[PDB]
Amino acid sequence: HSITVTTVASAGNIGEDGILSCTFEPDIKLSDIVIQWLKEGVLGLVHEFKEGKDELSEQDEMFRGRTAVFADQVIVGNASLRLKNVQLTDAGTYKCYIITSKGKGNANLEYKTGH
Numbered sequence: 345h346s347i348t349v350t351t352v353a354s355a356g357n358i359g360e361d362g363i364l365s366c367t368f369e370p371d372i373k374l375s376d377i378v379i380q381w382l383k384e385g386v387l388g389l390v391h392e393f394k395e396g397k398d399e400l401s402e403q404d405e406m407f408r409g410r411t412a413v414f415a416d417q418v419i420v421g422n423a424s425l426r427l428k429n430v431q432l433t434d435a436g437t438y439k440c441y442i443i444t445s446k447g448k449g450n451a452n453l454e455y456k457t458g459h
């Protein structure tokens with residue numbers, strides 16, 4: 345917890361695109377930033393962004409083709425995740441995990457889904 349990472353309440357509707365909100369203590373160079381999103385009990389990653397691009401070789405099957413970050417906003421500390429066509433199976437506890445040149449941090453988020 346050497347850097348600040350914060351989530352805020354995030355909730356979507358089933359069948360519609362959603363957002364999982366995460367912010368962090370912003371770093372100066374994009375190359376120093378790593379974002380990882382995890383979901384409780386899930387073997388693969390939800391999403392990873394490293395060296396200015398997505399790195400999804402270890403992404404869990406439940407999220408293949410369904411996730412994006414805001415690559416233009418990572419430099420200002422915006423680690424929010426876009427989730428395509430939210431499903432009831434997406435509900436649960438997520439973790440936003442951040443590395444910068446100044447250290448690391450993480451915060452959890454409870455994502456809610458409903459009709």
Ligand SMILES: *[C@@H]1O[C@H](CO)[C@@H](O[C@@H]2O[C@H](CO)[C@@H](O[C@@H]3O[C@H](CO[C@H]4O[C@H](CO)[C@@H](O)[C@H](O)[C@@H]4O)[C@@H](O)[C@H](O[C@H]4O[C@H](CO)[C@@H](O)[C@H](O)[C@@H]4O)[C@@H]3O)[C@H](O)[C@H]2NC(C)=O)[C@H](O)[C@H]1NC(C)=O
Nearest residue numbers: 354355356357361362363365366367414417422424426427
């Ligand atoms: C990081 O940078 C981005 C880009 O500028 C900002 O993006 C906006 O984020 C807000 C939420 O903070 C978005 O509004 C939310 O949209 C959700 C649906 O999102 C998907 O679909 C739309 C297209 O229809 C896309 O624009 C979006 O990128 C996703 O693909 C809704 O589910 C949200 O509603 C929920 O939260 C609100 C409170 O925020 C509740 O009141 C609702 O009841 C519900 O629970 C919400 O409406 C907005 O569309 C995004 N804009 C753009 C241009 O993409 C982020 O804000 C920023 N995040 C940081 C800094 O933390």
